[PDB]
Design an enzyme around this catalytic site. Structure first.
Site, PDB file in Angstrom:
ATOM      1  N   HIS B 348       0.789  -1.235   0.000  1.00 43.70           N
ATOM      2  CA  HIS B 348       0.000   0.000   0.000  1.00 43.70           C
ATOM      3  C   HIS B 348       0.822   1.286   0.000  1.00 43.70           C
ATOM      4  CE1 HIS B 348      -3.958  -1.942   0.747  1.00 43.70           C
ATOM      5  NE2 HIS B 348      -3.233  -2.840   1.389  1.00 43.70           N
ATOM      6  N   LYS B 539      -7.766  14.519   4.891  1.00 44.53           N
ATOM      7  CA  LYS B 539      -6.900  13.341   4.825  1.00 44.53           C
ATOM      8  C   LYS B 539      -5.954  13.498   6.002  1.00 44.53           C
ATOM      9  CE  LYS B 539      -5.875  14.545   0.682  1.00 44.53           C
ATOM     10  NZ  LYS B 539      -5.803  13.380  -0.238  1.00 44.53           N
ATOM     11  N   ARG B 540      -5.241  12.439   6.354  1.00 44.66           N
ATOM     12  CA  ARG B 540      -4.302  12.531   7.463  1.00 44.66           C
ATOM     13  C   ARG B 540      -3.245  13.589   7.165  1.00 44.66           C
ATOM     14  NH1 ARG B 540      -4.271   8.384  11.561  1.00 44.66           N
ATOM     15  NH2 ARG B 540      -2.436   9.591  12.236  1.00 44.66           N
ATOM     16  N   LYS B 545       1.613  14.510   1.722  1.00 48.98           N
ATOM     17  CA  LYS B 545       0.305  14.953   1.241  1.00 48.98           C
ATOM     18  C   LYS B 545       0.268  16.471   0.982  1.00 48.98           C
ATOM     19  CE  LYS B 545      -2.107  11.088   3.501  1.00 48.98           C
ATOM     20  NZ  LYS B 545      -2.919  10.456   2.417  1.00 48.98           N
ATOM     21  N   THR B 647      -7.852   7.324  -1.812  1.00 52.63           N
ATOM     22  CA  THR B 647      -9.246   6.912  -1.997  1.00 52.63           C
ATOM     23  C   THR B 647     -10.210   8.061  -1.743  1.00 52.63           C
ATOM     24  OG1 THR B 647      -9.285   6.011   0.251  1.00 52.63           O
ATOM     25  CG2 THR B 647      -8.915   4.469  -1.555  1.00 52.63           C
ATOM     26  N   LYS B 651     -13.901   9.475  -3.691  1.00 52.45           N
ATOM     27  CA  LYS B 651     -15.103   9.909  -2.976  1.00 52.45           C
ATOM     28  C   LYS B 651     -15.577  11.260  -3.466  1.00 52.45           C
ATOM     29  CE  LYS B 651     -13.294   7.551   1.052  1.00 52.45           C
ATOM     30  NZ  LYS B 651     -12.694   7.742   2.355  1.00 52.45           N
TER      31      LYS B 651
HETATM   32  N1  LIG Z   1      -0.667   3.057   5.688  1.00 50.98           N
HETATM   33  C1  LIG Z   1      -1.315   3.423   4.588  1.00 50.98           C
HETATM   34  N2  LIG Z   1      -2.380   4.226   4.584  1.00 50.98           N
HETATM   35  C2  LIG Z   1      -2.870   4.486   3.359  1.00 50.98           C
HETATM   36  O1  LIG Z   1      -3.847   5.228   3.244  1.00 50.98           O
HETATM   37  C3  LIG Z   1      -2.266   3.806   2.265  1.00 50.98           C
HETATM   38  O2  LIG Z   1      -3.156   2.809   1.715  1.00 50.98           O
HETATM   39  C4  LIG Z   1      -4.292   3.312   0.978  1.00 50.98           C
HETATM   40  C5  LIG Z   1      -5.157   2.139   0.542  1.00 50.98           C
HETATM   41  O3  LIG Z   1      -4.407   1.386  -0.416  1.00 50.98           O
HETATM   42  C6  LIG Z   1      -3.791   4.143  -0.212  1.00 50.98           C
HETATM   43  O4  LIG Z   1      -4.896   4.693  -0.936  1.00 50.98           O
HETATM   44  C7  LIG Z   1      -2.893   5.285   0.264  1.00 50.98           C
HETATM   45  O5  LIG Z   1      -2.307   5.896  -0.890  1.00 50.98           O
HETATM   46  C8  LIG Z   1      -1.761   4.764   1.169  1.00 50.98           C
HETATM   47  O6  LIG Z   1      -1.043   5.853   1.782  1.00 50.98           O
HETATM   48  S1  LIG Z   1      -0.887   2.918   3.055  1.00 50.98           S
HETATM   49  C1  LIG Z   2     -11.266   7.910   2.447  1.00 44.37           C
HETATM   50  C2  LIG Z   2     -10.778   8.343   3.807  1.00 44.37           C
HETATM   51  C3  LIG Z   2      -9.332   8.573   4.034  1.00 44.37           C
HETATM   52  C4  LIG Z   2      -8.324   8.413   2.918  1.00 44.37           C
HETATM   53  O1  LIG Z   2      -8.267   9.658   2.222  1.00 44.37           O
HETATM   54  P1  LIG Z   2      -7.026  10.033   1.266  1.00 44.37           P
HETATM   55  O2  LIG Z   2      -7.349  11.430   0.820  1.00 44.37           O
HETATM   56  O3  LIG Z   2      -7.047   9.000   0.174  1.00 44.37           O
HETATM   57  O4  LIG Z   2      -5.831   9.947   2.179  1.00 44.37           O
HETATM   58  C5  LIG Z   2      -8.891   8.982   5.289  1.00 44.37           C
HETATM   59  N1  LIG Z   2      -9.730   9.162   6.318  1.00 44.37           N
HETATM   60  C6  LIG Z   2     -11.065   8.980   6.243  1.00 44.37           C
HETATM   61  C7  LIG Z   2     -11.934   9.200   7.454  1.00 44.37           C
HETATM   62  C8  LIG Z   2     -11.676   8.550   4.968  1.00 44.37           C
HETATM   63  O5  LIG Z   2     -13.012   8.359   4.875  1.00 44.37           O
END
Ligand SMILES: N=C1NC(=O)[C@]2(O[C@H](CO)[C@@H](O)[C@H](O)[C@H]2O)S1
Ligand SMILES: *Cc1c(COP(=O)(O)O)cnc(C)c1O
Ligand SMILES: N=C1NC(=O)[C@]2(O[C@H](CO)[C@@H](O)[C@H](O)[C@H]2O)S1
Ligand SMILES: *Cc1c(COP(=O)(O)O)cnc(C)c1O
Lengths: 807, 807
Positions: B348, B539-540, B545, B647, B651
């Protein structure tokens, strides 16, 4: 099957079967193909619980509408045992559920054995609180039991190589269907911090907070549709590097983790003090909240009674003062009047090692404001003593709440007497001992405070539930009313010469003995003669209870048989059971001695089936329900003046065993009720013990003058009962010979002679049974309904009622 | 109300009302007079849960009868969020429950807000597992999610003085109605001990035992009557001075206490390793038990697939070998074949600090037999490498499972590749990066192993549930089938010139923005202009990022306004939210910077309502469900090559926001699907980043040549955004100027220019909305149904099905 178990109406049975299947499916998420016996237990429990709910809600709303005076029974222990059968009995559902489960292809008694005991107590004190809750509900009192929801109750006892091993009692592992968590009523409890004195008064600041989350358990009255509440508090950390901080939440939550397993012994540990304050602080906030939701605290004692079960919740007194003075801003004198009129204290023992004396330095650190309030109480109290007894400086130091010495301590019993309008002992002899010895000074100052409330047991659990066969044959003659009016058993005296009744009483006992003898073989693969006299001593292991005296008799019987093998003796099965506190070495040695005697006696071919010695492992409420109905002889042999009441004694009396006992605790009143001719009384009275103490107890004298006793001691010392470890019992022998506080040798001769008279009577089945009938018939006084009615009228100022609420 | 929420049939509504009242009474033990809003939530949850049970039992018995190949998805994280609404959506109960509750005088949406998130994950990886469970159930796969039941999930974030504070997420405080404890399936897990070599093979002895107790949660498929299971393990001490021994049970139970809050960062802590082995050991025993209850392990890979979610459950490989070799007595080579064919591994991330490299000394102490097995795997693997690439000694050391150095470490990614028949990345660019860079050696040895499976999101939670208004206007045109066949959204391309649809799309967005703007004022008392462009980055918080790049743009906009106050600019509400790992200092400084910018911008009278900066506190799944539907612009601005997939991006695309982003992760494929003309693409590609790294990244160059950038850095350094603490952000400036791994300055110019083009398009509502329609219409590829169908066919060897089981 039997009438006292209620009606099995076609509609009731149909509805129970339907709801059982509903819970199995929707609640347990199982079907009959994968359901385990435990799943079936839970389905039944939920089904029975459903019948409590309406009554529970209606009872509590009834109390809200009528606003009666509320009784708050504060205890660190509630030894509830199992709940399923008890609930069925009190709701008249037993036969219906038996029928319903039978039609589903299940055995209800097998399902009942799956339930874990709620073992939130050590023994007698905890079990008394449980019987009391049952009686308060049955007598229609607006009563609440308040305690701690221990994650781990009294340890499970395993015997390994004749030694006690302790195992954690993980009683909540599979869930508890009887409790309802009430997180919405969560309250903060404060610890540590410091006191700040301002213009507006004292302030307790910089405290650490632990949350108290209540869990409510229903307490059903006997067929009166009253369901009261037992509220138990669980400790929760508040929500405010990172990982360690989260893991450290355990420290706060440890408060409600485990029951201290000491019976009649004070251990001055900080965690125990935290438990005591935790229950008190949470409970008092809850009481005050309920009182305000009915400013004018003059009426507080008219609407609230707080019963302190021993000194364990003694901090209620200074906590109530703290709230009234620091938070509600009442003047001291008014707050004190309210407190005294609200609180009453029950003393349960005079053994000095059991008395709570907390180091001042502990209270200073943990509860700094309470210490200040205690000093103030003490100063004002001692000013009254000085005014009543001018110049009596030694009385002042004897009566002080503060004990001087190496470490300063607070005497919590003294605090309780000062801050309560009533103080009672738990049997007539005990209450007299309180007035004549340990609280003599207090009695002289305030004689009106001192009362007696002789203990009792609930006849629901301790007859109807555990001994339906006996309940039925009694009901056949005198009807069912006695179950909530136990004095009606007196009517059985007119059947003492009734040949059919004599036959029925004896048959029920024989059936109970066969059932118990079978239980032993199945669950413990041990073989006993069911035609032998069942000689039973079950209770916590303690020197004062004198399991050792029993042991001496057993060895005497064994030696007599070995001396004259071909002489007839009445066969006996001697059963001893009970737990020892984990740190009580002598008690653990006593257990080892009992098993060691069993090893020798049970495998001696010359003895045969004439004498068997069995240690009953893991004695607890559910085991008491099995063994007590099977007993012929009840051993109640504490040294006169040491057993405040005893309650096991009453259980055996109600279930058709005769009693061999000293004139101690409630035995005195039991003998009085039944007649001394119908009791096997032996040994020193209290006055005899006092005479012996005056001139000094010399055990050597008895050893020198009783050859049979000398032989036993020589057998113990020489390694007769421990061949591969010849000196194993030296501590026991040394204690008996040189440091015996409980005068085992002094009662040996009279005990053995008395036991011979027991054997003589057992050889005449008809006269044995007639004496049994005389015991059962006069056991009525020892209903906890009688006890609670007396508390209600003489301490709480409320009237009991047998009238039923609408269903 | 709206059709996609199902039918409100008179009988259904009547039955729901009845069962709601039943649960309120019998389950919660309340009546309407004392019931709190939380009681009403629980009554509804239990009511909805009742409808799952039959389907759940039937699904699991169906799998038993048909014995399909079972899929086991092993993860340390499952970020489930709330369950109530999701369950209603998948059972078609939403409108019926809305009607039922409305008739009872309750607002269902208010009740939904009471449910706690199941926050058993950090972010994207955890949420992917959750979406995957939904899709596996919807596609009728016999799938089980296996993880840990953390007592505390991802911490609740509070902002105090602009700084993140962490609070324990006590999500189980009020109980979890969705889970069912299964104590009967409790399994032992072993730790520590030592290896003994005998004639019969190796033996792992003298271990410490922790019990693993499973809790099952139902996972309903979309309107197909399939209900799968997520099984989460909870740690329990076995039942074998006294008080301290009981209190020390906490040590064993700490294993499942808390989720490690690190996103994309490896912390080599022993407790984490224990968690990883705990889930693996319990799960594999459960798998094997289920397999035997269908000796011949040749068929094991035909009946079992194990998907490793990252390396976190990598110990599955040596654990499976341990069981097969030490316990089942299979020869090594056969066991290895079974293991490889059973296991598949998903990578990942390529960030080096995220890669698990466990110290050998830790494995040696905790898992001595596993270490031995890992060495054996390594030796045999390296023998294959040596045979394929003779003389290539550096390849041997590069590919070794064991890393040499100061401390020896095991590379868990290498172990996973060696022991799996398939290895996949999570977006096309990421999977290519794996083959070309970090796993190049492995790809050269075994190219057939390497695959791509582009991530997706469930359109149930991420459209139907969170954005019913949009789901409805789509359904009005093309029907409901798209909800489980998202590629059907392509049909919306024929409405891109439809004036009514353009109007509806825009109205739904406006409604979402108004609703969210109201949520902000109510729950956080902050006032925003709902006619502004909603510019959202959630996002985190992490350097890769590039929340900092966003910050630079915001300050640029602010400075431009201050320079020409009376010039028109498109109003924006810039919203940034996300949690920082507690020990990640720079991430915490970034949060403080964002709030500090907000403090200045939001109170500048000259700015007015033209620019607002809000930090969204406590970003989590339930908040994502609110903010994503309200967004106009999605910020996906990671440095090219760093975000494996993302992801959140998907969304936003599905919910009618346009994307500003780099060609990173799945953004590449999103742009490909929608067309680059309909995406705001900017910045370095991966190849550009590589070129910059070759010659060396010098941030000073950008500072020297971009006056607008120079001004911002001077403002930061001088204390413009921290007057009372002028040097507060020196660490940020120092990092940007001298130690920026993610080349923030390198993308600044193109980002700002691209943002101007965003503003230009937003001024033309009709053309904005037409581009939005083109995004929504091409979002179908990013359904996790597509992703899971590919895993199923290309890795697991099973066929998905949309056919429904009987109700
Ligand atoms: N420790 C991680 N947290 C993520 O969100 C990671 O996995 C996700 C699901 O495959 C990916 O979408 C993110 O790019 C990746 O940072 S790896
Ligand atoms: C989808 C989701 C994430 C992942 O978001 P990215 O922008 O892909 O890092 C993180 N936190 C929550 C609560 C989510 O629903
Ligand atoms: N810590 C104690 N445990 C008991 O059983 C005690 O209380 C009981 C209930 O009043 C009494 O019957 C017992 O005599 C007494 O020992 S005091
Ligand atoms: C009644 C009871 C006791 C108290 O018995 P005594 O003989 O009065 O000490 C102790 N333990 C249990 C389990 C009981 O039921």
């Amino acid at each position: 099957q039997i009438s006292v178990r209620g009606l099995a109406g076609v509609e009731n049975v149909t509805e129970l079967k339907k709801n059982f299947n509903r819970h199995l499916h929707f609640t347990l998420v199982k079907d009959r193909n994968v359901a385990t016996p435990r799943d079936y237990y839970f389905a039944l429990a939920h089904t029975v619980r459903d019948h409590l709910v309406g009554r529970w809600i209606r009872t509590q709303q009834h109390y809200y509408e009528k606003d009666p005076k509320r009784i708050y029974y504060l205890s660190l222990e509630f030894y509830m045992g199992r709940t399923l059968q008890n609930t069925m009995v009190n709701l008249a559902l037993e036969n219906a559920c038996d029928e319903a489960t039978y039609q589903l292809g299940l055995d209800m008694e097998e399902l009942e054995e799956i339930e874990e005991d709620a073992g939130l107590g050590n023994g007698g004190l905890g079990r008394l609180a449980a019987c009391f809750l049952d009686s308060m509900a049955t007598l229609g009192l607006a009563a609440y039991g308040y305690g701690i929801r221990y994650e781990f109750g009294i340890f499970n006892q395993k015997i390994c190589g004749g030694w006690q091993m302790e195992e954690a009692d993980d009683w909540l592992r599979y869930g508890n269907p009887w409790e309802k968590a009430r997180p919405e009523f969560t309250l903060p409890v404060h610890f540590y911090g410091r006191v700040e004195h301002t213009s507006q008064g004292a302030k307790w600041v910089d405290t650490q907070v632990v949350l108290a989350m209540p869990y409510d358990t229903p307490v059903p009255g006997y067929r009166n549709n009253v369901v009261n509440t037992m509220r138990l508090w669980s400790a929760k950390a508040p929500n405010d590097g990172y990982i360690q901080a989260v893991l450290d939440r355990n420290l706060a939550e440890n408060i409600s983790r485990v029951l201290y397993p000491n019976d009649n012994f004070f251990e001055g540990k900080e965690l125990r003090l935290k438990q005591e304050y935790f229950v008190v602080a949470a409970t008092l906030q809850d009481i005050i909240r309920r009182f305000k939701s009915s400013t004018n605290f003059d009426a507080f004692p008219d609407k609230v009674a707080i019963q302190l079960n021993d000194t364990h919740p003694s901090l209620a007194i200074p906590e109530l003062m703290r709230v009234l003075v620091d938070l509600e801003r009442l003047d001291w004198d008014k707050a004190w009047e309210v407190t005294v009129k609200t609180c009453a204290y029950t003393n349960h023992t005079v053994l000095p090692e059991a008395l709570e004396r907390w180091p001042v330095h502990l209270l200073e650190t943990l509860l700094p404001r309470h210490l200040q309030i205690i000093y103030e109480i003490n100063q004002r109290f001692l000013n009254r003593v000085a005014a009543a007894f001018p110049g009596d400086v030694d009385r002042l130091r004897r009566m002080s709440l503060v004990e001087e010495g190496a470490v300063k301590r607070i005497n919590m019993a003294h605090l309780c007497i000062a801050g309560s309008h009533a103080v009672n002992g738990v049997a007539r002899i005990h209450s007299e001992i309180l007035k004549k010895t340990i609280f003599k000074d207090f009695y002289e100052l305030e004689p009106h405070k001192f009362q007696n409330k002789t203990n009792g047991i609930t006849p629901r659990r301790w007859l109807v539930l555990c001994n339906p066969g006996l309940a039925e044959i009694i009901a056949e003659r005198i009807g069912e009313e006695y179950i909530s009016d136990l004095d009606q058993l007196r009517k059985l005296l007119s059947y003492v010469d009734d040949e059919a009744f004599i036959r029925d009483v004896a048959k029920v006992k024989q059936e109970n003995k066969l059932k118990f003898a079978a239980y032993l073989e199945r669950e413990y693969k041990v073989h006993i003669n069911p035609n032998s006299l069942f000689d039973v001593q079950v209770k916590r292991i303690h020197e004062y209870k004198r399991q050792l005296l029993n042991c001496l008799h057993v060895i005497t019987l064994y030696n007599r048989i070995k001396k004259e093998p071909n002489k007839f003796v009445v066969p006996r099965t001697v059963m001893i059971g009970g737990k020892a506190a984990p740190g009580y070495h002598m008690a653990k040695m006593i257990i080892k001695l009992i098993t060691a005697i069993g090893d020798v006696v049970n495998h001696d071919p010359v003895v045969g089936d004439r004498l068997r010695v069995i240690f009953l492992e893991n004695y607890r409420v559910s085991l008491a329900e099995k063994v007590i109905p099977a007993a012929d002889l009840s051993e109640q042999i504490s040294t006169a003046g040491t057993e405040a009441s005893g309650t096991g004694n009453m259980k055996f009396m109600l279930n058709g065993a005769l009693t061999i006992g000293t004139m101690d605790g409630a035995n005195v009143e039991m003998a009085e009720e039944a007649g001394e001719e119908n009791f096997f009384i032996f040994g020193m009275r209290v006055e005899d013990v006092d005479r012996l103490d005056q001139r000094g107890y010399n055990a050597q004298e008895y050893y020198d003058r009783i050859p049979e006793l000398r032989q036993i001691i020589e057998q113990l010392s020489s390694g007769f009962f421990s061949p591969k470890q010849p000196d194993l019992f030296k501590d026991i022998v040394n204690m008996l010979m040189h440091h015996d506080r409980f005068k085992v040798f002094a009662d040996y001769e009279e005990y053995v002679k008395c036991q011979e008279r027991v054997s003589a009577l057992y050889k005449n089945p008809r006269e044995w049974t007639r004496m049994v009938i005389r015991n059962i018939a006069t056991s009525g006084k020892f209903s906890s309904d009688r006890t609670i009615a007396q508390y209600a009228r003489e301490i709480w100022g409320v009237e009991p009622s047998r009238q039923r609420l609408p269903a």
